[PDB]
Design a protein around this ligand. Structure first.
Ligand code: EB5
Length: 133
């Protein structure tokens, strides 16, 4: 039989939403600081690039990524959420950062390059979080 299951193909999931008109939203001083200070300083770091967009499991050849990670998050998504005033409070934004870092540690092993990158960025994140208004 000549059906060899070379189709249908894999794919990346739809990325997390960055707009939601019926979601409650505010601008707070903490959320402005999270954009202006926390996100933008992390974004410029040389270890930021793996985290600047949703994981492209196809390009990166990580076909098990979304088998393991069911709540993906990345700083590109977070950056757009802050720019779109998506959040109600600082906690919602911070939980996105926590999710991103947690996904990295779940999927990978201690000592992997990606984990070392996440640890460094997390250490910085936590330092900047302590200067929150
Ligand atoms: C160390 C960078 N390696 S990569 O560009 O192949 C990559 C980018 C983003 C990743 C990963 C992950 C695992 C392994 C490699 C890798 C991963 O969890 N992410 C999202 C932070």
């Amino acid at each position: 039989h000549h059906h060899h299951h070379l189709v249908p193909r894999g794919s990346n999931p739809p990325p997390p939403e960055t707009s939601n008109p019926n979601k409650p939203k505010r601008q707070t001083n903490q959320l402005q600081y999270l954009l202006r200070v926390v996100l933008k300083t992390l974004w410029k770091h040389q270890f930021a690039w793996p985290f600047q967009q949703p994981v492209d499991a196809v390009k990166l050849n990580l076909p098990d990524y979304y088998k393991i990670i069911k709540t993906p998050m990345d700083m590109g998504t977070i950056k757009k959420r802050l720019e779109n005033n998506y959040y109600w409070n600082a906690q919602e934004c911070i939980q996105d950062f926590n999710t991103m870092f947690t996904n990295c540690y779940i999927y990978n092993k201690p000592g992997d390059d990606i984990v070392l990158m996440a640890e460094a960025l997390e250490k910085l994140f936590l330092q900047k979080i302590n200067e929150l208004p």
